[PDB]
Design an enzyme around this catalytic site. Structure first.
Site, PDB file in Angstrom:
ATOM      1  N   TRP A 103     -10.501  -8.736   2.958  1.00  0.00           N
ATOM      2  CA  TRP A 103     -11.237  -8.733   1.817  1.00  0.00           C
ATOM      3  C   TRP A 103     -11.255 -10.365   1.540  1.00  0.00           C
ATOM      4  O   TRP A 103     -11.951 -10.787   0.689  1.00  0.00           O
ATOM      5  CB  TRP A 103     -10.402  -8.146   0.675  1.00  0.00           C
ATOM      6  CG  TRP A 103     -10.482  -6.716   0.312  1.00  0.00           C
ATOM      7  CD1 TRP A 103     -11.588  -5.975  -0.269  1.00  0.00           C
ATOM      8  CD2 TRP A 103      -9.629  -5.826   1.012  1.00  0.00           C
ATOM      9  NE1 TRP A 103     -11.010  -4.780  -0.125  1.00  0.00           N
ATOM     10  CE2 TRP A 103     -10.088  -4.683   0.701  1.00  0.00           C
ATOM     11  CE3 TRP A 103      -8.626  -5.800   1.899  1.00  0.00           C
ATOM     12  CZ2 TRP A 103      -9.496  -3.272   0.671  1.00  0.00           C
ATOM     13  CZ3 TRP A 103      -7.713  -4.684   2.035  1.00  0.00           C
ATOM     14  CH2 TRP A 103      -8.255  -3.388   1.561  1.00  0.00           C
TER      15      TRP A 103
ATOM     16  N   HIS B 172       0.755   4.191  -2.911  1.00  0.00           N
ATOM     17  CA  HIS B 172       0.474   5.694  -2.410  1.00  0.00           C
ATOM     18  C   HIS B 172       1.227   6.629  -2.886  1.00  0.00           C
ATOM     19  O   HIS B 172       0.947   7.807  -3.003  1.00  0.00           O
ATOM     20  CB  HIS B 172       0.063   5.923  -1.009  1.00  0.00           C
ATOM     21  CG  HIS B 172      -1.678   5.460  -0.537  1.00  0.00           C
ATOM     22  ND1 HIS B 172      -2.169   6.213   0.428  1.00  0.00           N
ATOM     23  CD2 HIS B 172      -2.260   4.337  -0.999  1.00  0.00           C
ATOM     24  CE1 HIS B 172      -3.342   5.822   0.225  1.00  0.00           C
ATOM     25  NE2 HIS B 172      -3.583   4.648  -0.481  1.00  0.00           N
TER      26      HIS B 172
ATOM     27  N   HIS C  13      -5.666  -6.222  -3.377  1.00  0.00           N
ATOM     28  CA  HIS C  13      -6.672  -6.261  -2.190  1.00  0.00           C
ATOM     29  C   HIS C  13      -6.953  -7.620  -1.580  1.00  0.00           C
ATOM     30  O   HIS C  13      -7.622  -7.761  -0.824  1.00  0.00           O
ATOM     31  CB  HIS C  13      -7.998  -5.304  -2.564  1.00  0.00           C
ATOM     32  CG  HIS C  13      -7.854  -4.112  -2.496  1.00  0.00           C
ATOM     33  ND1 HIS C  13      -9.048  -2.841  -2.525  1.00  0.00           N
ATOM     34  CD2 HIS C  13      -6.656  -3.219  -2.090  1.00  0.00           C
ATOM     35  CE1 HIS C  13      -8.407  -1.683  -2.298  1.00  0.00           C
ATOM     36  NE2 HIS C  13      -7.352  -1.839  -1.907  1.00  0.00           N
TER      37      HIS C  13
ATOM     38  N   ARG D 204       0.856  -1.089   0.129  1.00  0.00           N
ATOM     39  CA  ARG D 204       0.029   0.042  -0.156  1.00  0.00           C
ATOM     40  C   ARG D 204       0.957   1.170   0.083  1.00  0.00           C
ATOM     41  O   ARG D 204       0.568   2.223  -0.697  1.00  0.00           O
ATOM     42  CB  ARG D 204      -0.956   0.232   1.283  1.00  0.00           C
ATOM     43  CG  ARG D 204      -2.166   0.979   1.078  1.00  0.00           C
ATOM     44  CD  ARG D 204      -2.871   1.245   2.606  1.00  0.00           C
ATOM     45  NE  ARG D 204      -3.334   2.549   2.294  1.00  0.00           N
ATOM     46  CZ  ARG D 204      -3.795   3.315   3.736  1.00  0.00           C
ATOM     47  NH1 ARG D 204      -3.191   3.069   4.714  1.00  0.00           N
ATOM     48  NH2 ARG D 204      -4.118   4.343   3.359  1.00  0.00           N
TER      49      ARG D 204
HETATM   50  C1  HEM Z   1      -9.677   3.100  -6.304  1.00  0.00           C
HETATM   51  C2  HEM Z   1      -8.561   2.430  -5.644  1.00  0.00           C
HETATM   52  C3  HEM Z   1      -8.228   2.001  -4.674  1.00  0.00           C
HETATM   53  C4  HEM Z   1      -8.868   2.810  -3.285  1.00  0.00           C
HETATM   54  C5  HEM Z   1      -9.947   3.379  -3.256  1.00  0.00           C
HETATM   55  C6  HEM Z   1      -8.398   2.026  -2.217  1.00  0.00           C
HETATM   56  C7  HEM Z   1      -8.755   2.053  -0.864  1.00  0.00           C
HETATM   57  C8  HEM Z   1      -8.058   1.478   0.275  1.00  0.00           C
HETATM   58  C9  HEM Z   1      -8.632   1.546   1.622  1.00  0.00           C
HETATM   59  C10 HEM Z   1      -9.584   2.325   2.050  1.00  0.00           C
HETATM   60  C11 HEM Z   1      -7.634   0.484   2.002  1.00  0.00           C
HETATM   61  C12 HEM Z   1      -7.488   0.259   3.864  1.00  0.00           C
HETATM   62  C13 HEM Z   1      -6.739   1.667   4.688  1.00  0.00           C
HETATM   63  C14 HEM Z   1      -6.916   1.216   6.104  1.00  0.00           C
HETATM   64  O1  HEM Z   1      -7.804   1.459   6.996  1.00  0.00           O
HETATM   65  O2  HEM Z   1      -5.677   0.865   6.727  1.00  0.00           O
HETATM   66  C15 HEM Z   1      -6.864  -0.066   1.247  1.00  0.00           C
HETATM   67  C16 HEM Z   1      -5.702  -0.778   1.703  1.00  0.00           C
HETATM   68  C17 HEM Z   1      -4.878  -1.530   1.020  1.00  0.00           C
HETATM   69  N1  HEM Z   1      -4.876  -1.083  -0.419  1.00  0.00           N
HETATM   70 FE1  HEM Z   1      -6.279  -0.377  -1.626  1.00  0.00          FE
HETATM   71  N2  HEM Z   1      -7.465   0.804  -2.641  1.00  0.00           N
HETATM   72  C18 HEM Z   1      -7.402   1.268  -3.935  1.00  0.00           C
HETATM   73  C19 HEM Z   1      -6.281   0.749  -4.530  1.00  0.00           C
HETATM   74  C20 HEM Z   1      -5.188  -0.030  -4.491  1.00  0.00           C
HETATM   75  C21 HEM Z   1      -4.274  -0.523  -5.382  1.00  0.00           C
HETATM   76  C22 HEM Z   1      -4.056   0.056  -6.847  1.00  0.00           C
HETATM   77  C23 HEM Z   1      -3.171  -0.945  -4.611  1.00  0.00           C
HETATM   78  C24 HEM Z   1      -2.087  -1.788  -4.893  1.00  0.00           C
HETATM   79  C25 HEM Z   1      -1.395  -2.054  -6.073  1.00  0.00           C
HETATM   80  C26 HEM Z   1      -3.887  -1.107  -3.250  1.00  0.00           C
HETATM   81  C27 HEM Z   1      -3.167  -1.862  -2.204  1.00  0.00           C
HETATM   82  C28 HEM Z   1      -3.624  -1.745  -0.733  1.00  0.00           C
HETATM   83  C29 HEM Z   1      -3.331  -2.791   0.161  1.00  0.00           C
HETATM   84  C30 HEM Z   1      -2.233  -3.895  -0.163  1.00  0.00           C
HETATM   85  C31 HEM Z   1      -4.035  -2.264   1.348  1.00  0.00           C
HETATM   86  C32 HEM Z   1      -3.859  -3.095   2.576  1.00  0.00           C
HETATM   87  C33 HEM Z   1      -3.109  -2.245   3.552  1.00  0.00           C
HETATM   88  C34 HEM Z   1      -3.133  -2.810   5.118  1.00  0.00           C
HETATM   89  O3  HEM Z   1      -3.573  -4.149   5.451  1.00  0.00           O
HETATM   90  O4  HEM Z   1      -2.677  -2.095   5.986  1.00  0.00           O
HETATM   91  N3  HEM Z   1      -5.162  -0.458  -3.048  1.00  0.00           N
HETATM   92  N4  HEM Z   1      -7.154   0.430   0.147  1.00  0.00           N
END
Ligand code: HEM
EC number: 1.11.1.5
Length: 291
Positions: free
Chosen positions: A188, A49, A172, A45
């Site tokens: 997820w 970002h 995700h 993540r």
């Molecule tokens: C429209 C696209 C996306 C949105 C709105 C989105 C939003 C989010 C949100 C709301 C979280 C949880 C944050 C938290 O409360 O800790 C999250 C986690 C995460 N995102 Fe996404 N996401 C998007 C795209 C992506 C993409 C493109 C990647 C990577 C190639 C990605 C990888 C991750 C990963 C691995 C997590 C888990 C992080 C953790 O467990 O702390 N996301 N995302």
């Protein structure tokens, strides 16, 4: 803006393989973080970002500059919770002080995917730290309460097409949402620190129900205890996105090959590589090295 890639002076493949090895060994060691998920997910993540701020129109943002290190970016509401990934990498940066920040943040994401049994991601070095005034303003990262049209339009600024967006979103499968960071709560899927095509299989096979969570936001919840953001659920509401979701749900190897291409493109957006620059490095895992 032009951002030309410049290799850290005198460094070769073997030097970068040592930095990879330091991140991978520490991922092994700090296994208890976030109820034994480990730091692998917050690290991919973080790499997304710092890359997702790019604007194709004026070449601002993106991974090159390592600008997450500055307060404005670091304190962006959309980056809440990434401080954990930053603090993980900090002792590694004191050990290898010659690596740029943009190269370390992006390599963390590569290391995390490959150590979680994901595909090999070819990586190039050469990002150069840029000053605090080049730091992008907050608000360039995506909202979660939106539909498939918002997703397509948003990812066009990073010039990602439909196949690239659906492959990227497959990350995700990893980690989870945290109520205190984003206003959403839940994983997820079940195997959330192993890289598989599980995100697609759950999206097609679970019985999702729309509910409000404790932060008053809507999310889709299943009987199994999993969730999906409105933006994730979008991928089966849009007809073009849905055919690709089915393709990855039936073929994890095709998903691995497309995620690999899309993730490298995401980490390289905004950067010009000279003809003399080294070819992309493919790092060996701890396991391939017997470590
Ligand atoms: C429209 C696209 C996306 C949105 C709105 C989105 C939003 C989010 C949100 C709301 C979280 C949880 C944050 C938290 O409360 O800790 C999250 C986690 C995460 N995102 Fe996404 N996401 C998007 C795209 C992506 C993409 C493109 C990647 C990577 C190639 C990605 C990888 C991750 C990963 C691995 C997590 C888990 C992080 C953790 O467990 O702390 N996301 N995302």
């Amino acid at each position: 803006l032009v951002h030309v890639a410049s290799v850290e002076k005198g460094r070769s493949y073997e030097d970068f393989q040592k930095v990879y090895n330091a991140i991978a060994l520490k991922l092994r060691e700090d296994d208890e973080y976030d109820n034994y998920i480990g730091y692998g997910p917050v690290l991919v993540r973080l790499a997304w970002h710092i890359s997702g701020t790019w604007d194709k129109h004026d070449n601002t943002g993106g991974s090159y500059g390592g600008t997450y290190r500055f307060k404005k970016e670091f304190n962006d509401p959309s980056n809440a919770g990434l401080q954990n990934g930053f603090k993980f990498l900090e002792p590694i940066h004191k050990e290898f002080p010659w690596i740029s920040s943009g190269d370390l943040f992006s390599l963390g994401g590569v290391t995390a995917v490959q150590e979680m049994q994901g595909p090999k991601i070819p990586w190039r070095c050469g990002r150069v730290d840029t000053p605090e005034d080049t730091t992008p303003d907050n608000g360039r990262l995506p909202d979660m309460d939106k539909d498939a049209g918002y997703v397509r339009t948003f990812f066009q600024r990073l010039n990602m097409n439909d196949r690239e967006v659906v492959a990227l979103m497959g990350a995700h499968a990893l980690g989870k949402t945290h109520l205190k960071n984003s206003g959403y709560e839940g994983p997820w899927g079940a195997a959330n620190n192993v890289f598989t095509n599980e995100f697609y299989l759950n999206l097609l096979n679970e019985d999702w129900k729309l509910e409000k969570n404790d932060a008053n936001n809507e999310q889709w919840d299943s009987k199994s205890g999993y969730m999906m953001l409105p933006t994730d659920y979008s991928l089966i509401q849009d007809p073009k996105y849905l055919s690709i979701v089915k393709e990855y749900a039936n073929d994890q190897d095709k998903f691995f090959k497309d995620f690999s291409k899309a993730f490298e493109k995401l980490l390289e957006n905004g950067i010009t590589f000279p003809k003399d620059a080294p070819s992309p490095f493919i790092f060996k895992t701890l396991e391939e090295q017997g470590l």
